Design an enzyme around this catalytic site. Sequence first.
Site, PDB file in Angstrom:
ATOM      1  N   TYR A 105      34.434  10.769 -20.591  1.00 61.71           N
ATOM      2  CA  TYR A 105      33.453  10.495 -19.484  1.00 61.71           C
ATOM      3  C   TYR A 105      34.273  10.964 -18.290  1.00 61.71           C
ATOM      4  O   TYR A 105      34.257  10.326 -17.065  1.00 61.71           O
ATOM      5  CB  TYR A 105      33.030   9.042 -19.028  1.00 61.71           C
ATOM      6  CG  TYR A 105      32.403   8.345 -20.524  1.00 61.71           C
ATOM      7  CD1 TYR A 105      31.920   8.958 -21.559  1.00 61.71           C
ATOM      8  CD2 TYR A 105      32.433   6.947 -20.516  1.00 61.71           C
ATOM      9  CE1 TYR A 105      31.403   8.482 -22.626  1.00 61.71           C
ATOM     10  CE2 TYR A 105      31.814   6.587 -21.644  1.00 61.71           C
ATOM     11  CZ  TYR A 105      31.330   7.104 -22.736  1.00 61.71           C
ATOM     12  OH  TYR A 105      30.608   6.708 -23.795  1.00 61.71           O
TER      13      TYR A 105
ATOM     14  N   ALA B  89      15.758   4.259 -24.293  1.00 63.18           N
ATOM     15  CA  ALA B  89      15.108   5.487 -24.551  1.00 63.18           C
ATOM     16  C   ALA B  89      13.932   5.003 -25.308  1.00 63.18           C
ATOM     17  O   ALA B  89      13.657   4.173 -25.980  1.00 63.18           O
ATOM     18  CB  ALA B  89      16.308   6.355 -25.258  1.00 63.18           C
ATOM     19  N   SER B  90      12.981   6.161 -25.283  1.00 64.46           N
ATOM     20  CA  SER B  90      11.639   5.814 -25.534  1.00 64.46           C
ATOM     21  C   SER B  90      10.615   7.033 -26.084  1.00 64.46           C
ATOM     22  O   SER B  90      10.953   8.248 -25.644  1.00 64.46           O
ATOM     23  CB  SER B  90      11.027   4.770 -24.655  1.00 64.46           C
ATOM     24  OG  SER B  90      11.416   3.407 -25.004  1.00 64.46           O
TER      25      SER B  90
END
Lengths: 255, 253
Positions: free
Chosen positions: A64, A210-211
């Site tokens: 990251y 999430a979706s």
Amino acid sequence: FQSMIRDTLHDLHRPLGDTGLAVSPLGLGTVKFGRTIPDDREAADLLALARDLGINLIDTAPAYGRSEERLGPLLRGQREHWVIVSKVGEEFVDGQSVFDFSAAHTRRSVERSLKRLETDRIELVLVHSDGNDLDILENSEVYPTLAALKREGLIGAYGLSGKTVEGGLRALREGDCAMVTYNLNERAERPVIEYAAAHAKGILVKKALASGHQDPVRASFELVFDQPGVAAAIVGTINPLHLAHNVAMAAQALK
Amino acid sequence: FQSMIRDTLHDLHRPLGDTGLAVSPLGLGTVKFGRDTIPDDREAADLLALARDLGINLIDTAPAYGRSEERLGPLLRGQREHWVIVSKVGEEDGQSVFDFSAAHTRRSVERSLKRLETDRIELVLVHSDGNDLDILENSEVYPTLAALKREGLIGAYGLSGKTVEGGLRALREGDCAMVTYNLNERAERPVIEYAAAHAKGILVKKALASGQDPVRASFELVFDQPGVAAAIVGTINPLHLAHNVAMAAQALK
């Protein structure tokens, strides 16, 4: 004045398998600390707010960007509050991700992570898989090296941040914990959670929010915390209002 | 860290038709303040204070909302000048009661001014039972409101209607129509379109009622209509209010 932060997670801490670590049901993710990126000010404020919201779990990785490097300074004076999760094996060099699961690199990465975080030990270190979980856990040196590092006291526990159900299951045979994807669209790794639930093993859920489909965050958290195996869900938000909201919805989902 | 009220509505104020009133695109609704669980005087003062810092200057009430009116007077002391107040006439133990007589219209508005501790109300809307057109045509309410406007007791008048035909009439003589418009219910679109064409005020009620945020989707629909000045929101949860305001700012980009 402004007590919009009425709902917190202080009284909802849960054990992470048999590791002896107690964690808030939400953990702060810090991908966006290193990858728009928060100002040192904005980052200190997000940690400060997370703390007062009852969060004591924080997730990072060598991959990251500089998340690790930044966190050391930012956590000065409060490290003891935090259960830190980090990872080994993924590196992100020029353009692209690079993977190394050698013992040499595992040991070199965890040493560097301790240095960057300005601390003598990391609560949990997870194998950072390229997707080939099972082959990595079987034919590479990483998992036994993590085991050694656990004995040596440099890490508190170890595990896998996997992508496959078969990998998640192996990680739990010898290791302590699996970080698995589980959200309204993707539920293939449910067996790993169910297995963990049966054998006192740690589960962290990534990508809970999430979706594609009555608050979506609340629906997501309802799904995730309906599984008894789940200890915490890591959330990626840097917007303090969305964080307070996320925390509210999580408290409501756990009633 | 308490600048999680980062997105506000301060620079998004819009005129309400040709009334000369400028209003935030969200208005605070205060039904739950007097309950057609109810906020503590503390919780209520805090909701108003947060609304203000969120850029809201529009507040909606009615005689029918229990004691909303009565409570607001004290609560608005020292800040009334900030607020564009909308109230209503016509709806009033167990049940509704409706009276559209001139006597009652005038008696209600006097009482509203008294309760709100103020010499004038920016907008007063007719509180319809559903029979909009008959009320606007065969009752004394609309001409009375027109008189009260001349007399300076109210700044503008209109209808909080339920029918498309009623909304259209309200706008022929009156200043403004409060209409239902949400993802499930779009029948009153013509009233919005007509208002858009003739410089007339539209307030939307029930914007958030449904069957990738739902609030953002609702506000996108509502503010895609050029006719709409403001949407009234019913929330008393300060966090949901801050969130609602954020989504509204995003929908208006």
